[PDB]
Every structure is written in structure tokens, then in C-alpha cells.
């Protein structure tokens, strides 16, 4: 459990001099919070006689098969996990403010596109009083930026 | 004196159009 | 893992649209309100707090409905003309947003809420309940 | 000195005796029901539990009313048909006596309660509310 | 209180031979000014225990 | 220059360079004087693609 200062109020409002009084502004909030932790479990079986007289070790393989499946599933859940018995991810809960890029024309049609304007506008539009901020994108998406061409043909 | 304290339950999804400068066109 | 949060903090109905209800705060030692709407509002909407006494016929049955004098804190600028407690749901409260409030000095054995006169149309759209905090027995 | 307990475990109406009400439980991580009868009952009354899903059109309005899957624990020895969360208010439950319970495994976005077929007439004399608990929102 | 030169003004110009028209010209202003200062004045109060 | 068949007067950077280098260097080194808006006018010119 943890606290989250929601907002400050406002108290010091300008007033005229010749009066011996003041004005009670409004106070803020504290908004105590909480949160849980979820579990990850499962089982499998072998066969005494099969595993014993087998070509090679099958057990240790399943061990590594669990640690990685746990590893990849956690990160995958941490991003897009639906609240129920899974950590609510930052993709799907739609709490982050999300932009969208308006389409372009082609031969009279109108197709959705992702120009070089967007990525330069998107990254440079982030409140400068929150500090620096890294970005994330899939390798192919960056491979889309690299191979961009202007009207003549130059990169 | 009751001090009403109110929060919203569901946050409505947002969507902002990331408009950008149009292509350069001369004035004339 | 959710705890059985009904074996403490047990709530009861206080205003289900068109019917008030006495809710005993005798044993418990702390209690508040949770105002939640079901539709849009039209104008402002007030509410009148009350309290009751154990009737002489049976010490476990509601008596009459007496109001609650609003005790002021520091930094109060206005007091209702009669000095009786009153809570108002401000205009423009969307029906997916709960409001919270409580009277700062308990008196009696149980509480009651009712729409202030002339403001009983919107009153239907409101739903009020009361939670608790202690046991004492 | 009674703390405002509206915030920090508010409550909402789940079954007002006439119609059910879905109560959002997404922003909170714990919840429970506080039953309360208004009059003398006739026969054992049971209630069916339902959980909902965010509608594909609007993500914070009710969808359909899916049925919560009942889950046993260590010493559960009388699971009903196929498993469905269904609590039963026993008889010999006079008024001014609240009973409370909850469902162990949460699922969906919010819960709704409705009288089981065969107990709707008795259920017109009962009230059910929920008091959530704490969580981040 | 401070001072503000509004303008300077002209001084009779470039006469080759006496026609006697622009003798004194016209000068500018000095425009004394003023200005006050303001103040906030807020308060707040807790009782004794809800603070303790 | 013929703006869509209208022949408005104009003054474009090609004019400035051809004007200042034409000075016969046998007279010496020469300085150019102009109003600061003109220099602003030169500094804001654009070629058809849009660059400065």
C-alpha cells in the first residue's frame, strides 16, 4: 500500500491592503492506495519407466522450459495483461494518453500512413518538465523509418 | 458541515489527432 | 485474494430511489456516506439528515425523525438558515463517480437521509448507502 | 470524531429488492456482500452471482451477464452442479441481523446479483450491498 | 516614483538666410510616474487532534 | 516577373548578387547601405521546393 498526493489546493489569493482579515482557500488530497501480487503455477508429469530408460535427460529440459515460459509470459503480461489475476498492463488499460496519425491521399483514395513528420513531432511533444524519456518500438518499425524516401528518390 | 469528496470511476478513453504542418505551398 | 470485507465495514441501504431507511449506528463507532447516481441530473439536489431515538414501546424500533444540528468546524463562512445539517449533490456529477461525506458529530442511535422539499424529482436518480468502521461489541 | 469513511471503502447498491445493479469493481482489489433482510422470510432463499465484461462499444458500460464460476477449496465437499457461485440466505434470519460473504476468485470487471428462480418472491424483502476496499484505480 | 522621457522634440533647422519662422521649435516631456505593490494574505486552521 | 501572367515588380536574390559584383573593382572597395527590412527581406527568400 502507498500514498499518492493527488493535487495541491490554492490559498494565497491577492486582496486589497486596508482590511484585517484573510480567506480560507481549499485544501488538497492524499488518496491512500493499495495493490496486490499474483501467483504463477502449474504442473507436469513424467513416467518412471519411460524417463529412466530414455535416450537422455528430459527432466532438466523441462526445468529450463518452465523458467523461460515464466520469463516470457511475465513480460508479455506486464505489457498487455488484463487486470483479472494478471498485472494490469500499460497497453490495454488505456490510461496512457494515446495519439493517432491522420491518413494521406493516394489516387483519390485515403489510406492510413505513418510519415517522418509524425515520429519527429511525436518524440518532441513531451512535457519538458517530466525529465528525459526513452522510447520503445519494434525492430521492423525502425526498419520503416530507415528506408524512407522523398519525392525525387533520395533517402 | 459535510465535506463532499468525489472521484470518477471509469476514465473515458482519449484519442488526440497528432496533426502536423502541411506541405509548403507558396502564397500566390 | 480478496478478504471477506463484509464481516467489517458492513453497509446498508439509506436511500433507494424513493424510500428512506433507518440504519443503526449504535454498535459501530464511525460511519460515512457514498453518494452515487444512476442517471444525469437536472438541477442541484439537496438532502436532509435526521436521527432517531429508541421508542419507549421497544428499545429496538425506530421512533420519530428529528433533524441534526450542523456543528461548524473552524473556517466556516456560511451556516444554513436553521443551523440544521444538509448535504447537496452539486450539479454536473456524472453517473459513474461516487461521492463521499459524513456528519462530524454523531448523536442518537441511527441515521436517516431524505430529499429536501422541492428537490424530490432528481432524488429518484440518486442512490445513497452507509458503511461502518467499528464494532465495540 | 468519526473519520470520513466514504472514501477508503465506499459502498454501492447491488440488490434493492426490485432490480439488480452492476457495481464496478475494477479499480478496487477486494469486495464483499453484506446481506440484510427487511422482514420475516418464508423459505430458504438463494442468490445467483454474475460477473460482467466491458462492452465492445463503450469500455465502461455493462455487457452481458456472464455467470461466475464456483471454485472449491481444501474442505469443500458439496459442490453444486458444475460449479456456479450461488449463496443461500438460510431461514431463521430475523431483521437487525446482517450476514456477509464474498467470492474467492474475482473475474471480469464487475458483479451483479439476482434472485434464483424459485426465491424471487421472498427476495423482495432483502437487500444486498457491496463495500470495495482500497485499491489503486 | 520614476521618470519617463516621453519624447525629445525638434530644434529649428537649417536656415541658410533669415526667414524667421522656426525659432524655438518644440521640446518634449518628462512624465513623472508612480506605482504601488500588492499582497496575498491567506490563512488556514486545524483543530488539535485531527492534526495530532 | 510574370506571376500567372500579371507582371508584378519583384526583387530576388539573383538581383542582389549581380548588382554588387558588377562594381568595377578599379574604383576601390565599396560598402553597401540599406534599410534593415531589406536585409530581412533577403534573408527570408525561398526557392520553389521550399528551402531557404
Automatic annotation (TrEMBL), chain A:
Coiled coil: none annotated. This is Major capsid protein. The chain holds residues 208 to 362 of 465 of the full protein. Signal peptide: none annotated. It comes from Agrobacterium phage Milano. It comes from the Viruses. Transmembrane segments: none annotated.
From TrEMBL, chains C, D:
This is Virion-associated protein.
